[PDB]
Amino acid sequence: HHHSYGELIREIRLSKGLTQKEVYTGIISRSYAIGFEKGKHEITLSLFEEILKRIMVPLDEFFFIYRDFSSTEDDSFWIDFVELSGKNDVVGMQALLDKITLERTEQSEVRKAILHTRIQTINHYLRTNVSNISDEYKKIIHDYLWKMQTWTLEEVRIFSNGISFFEEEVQIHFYQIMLKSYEKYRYYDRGRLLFCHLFANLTDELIIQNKINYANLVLEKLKEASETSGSFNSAFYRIVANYYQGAIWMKEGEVEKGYRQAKRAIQTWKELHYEAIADLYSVVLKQFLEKENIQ
């Protein structure tokens, strides 16, 4: 985020050998352009899009450059939270919680509830094996999503943390709403991978719970999402889908076919230098063979 917009436009314009005349003519006047390039005028967004076109830089690339080549989002909540969750850093989450608390936006309630629940869960796990969570925070999350008819990706992310907090009927109802947004977003490069990840997680959890009809339904979505418009960017999740199709085959009595497919996915992750993923799925596979009691 730590980087005016017009000062960057100037630098880019200059790097391309473009004149002010050719960048700004018909968009804004000469002196307005001079002011904008010194950071003395706030540009409107509609005028800004036209200027970006004149220097051939899409909005998102501009912001990537503008945040000094680091993030593709202003608001780093989900990036930060995922990183902290991932390495279980309860001290870091508490700091993230303190920060967003000082802004105290009213609607940061759901994000705060997520963080609180994650801090209570991690700290209980540090004292026991097993999970220790307040009803108040689960209620906040439930009630935020309750009665919404259409989701943006924020709710997709919320749902994916909150899902175990809801009764089955409610989980299914939210899933059906999620699906309407999936249908729009499956052609969005960023949204597509978030849906793949969520569908992978659900498929995994459904298998473990032996809800095989549902696991098949969700797997079909993971397959579709990962194959959407022949996308290159979702190859990884096609491997994931192959792994879970393998597991489901084992459960449907197609054991040797299922097992060979699952082993092939693991080998594929190895061959493509995703070793840590391969290792993790090997554990999943072994535990599955045991729980399901397979040979």
Tell me how far apart the 2 most distant CA atoms of the chain are, in Å. 78
**Are 282 and 266 spatial neighbours (Cβ–Cβ below 8 Å)?**
yes
Distance CA 151, CA 178 (A): 7
Give the residue, chosen from 165, 257, 274, 294, that forms a contact with a second copy under the rule CB under 8 A.
274
Distance CA 133, CA 121 (A): 6
- Does position 83 interact with a second copy (CB under 8 A)? The reply is no
Q: Which is nearer to a second copy, 16 or 139 (CB)?
A: 16
**Are 55 and 18 spatial neighbours (Cβ–Cβ below 8 Å)?**
yes
Smallest separation, CB 6 to a second copy (Å): 10
Instruction: Specify the stretch interacting with a second copy by CB under 8 A; choose among 90-98, 116-124, 202-210, 225-233.
Output: 225-233
Look up residue 137 and give its amino acid: Y
Residue of 122, 106, 104, 114 lying closest to 80 (CA atoms): 114
Q: Which is nearer to a second copy, 57 or 214 (CB)?
A: 57
**Are 234 and 228 spatial neighbours (Cβ–Cβ below 8 Å)?**
yes
Smallest separation, CB 104 to a second copy (Å): 11
- Does position 66 interact with a second copy (CB under 8 A)? The reply is no
Residue 18: partners with Cβ closer than 8 Å, 6 or more residues away: 54, 55
Give the residue, chosen from 31, 60, 135, 176, that forms a contact with a second copy under the rule CB under 8 A.
60
**Residues 23-42 vs a second copy: string with x where CB under 8 A?**
-------------------x
Give the residue, chosen from 20, 32, 35, 54, that forms a contact with a second copy under the rule CB under 8 A.
54
Look up residue 49 and give its amino acid: E
Which of helix, strand or coil describes residue 47?
Answer: helix
Element (H, E) at 175: helix 168-185
- Does position 153 interact with a second copy (CB under 8 A)? The reply is yes
Smallest separation, CB 195 to a second copy (Å): 13
In the complex, the residues that contact a second copy under the rule CB under 8 A are 5, 12, 15-18, 22, 42-46, 48-49, 52-54, 56-61, 63-65, 69-70, 72-75, 105-107, 147-150, 152-154, 184-185, 187-191, 193, 227, 230, 232-239, 242, 264, 268, 271-274, 276
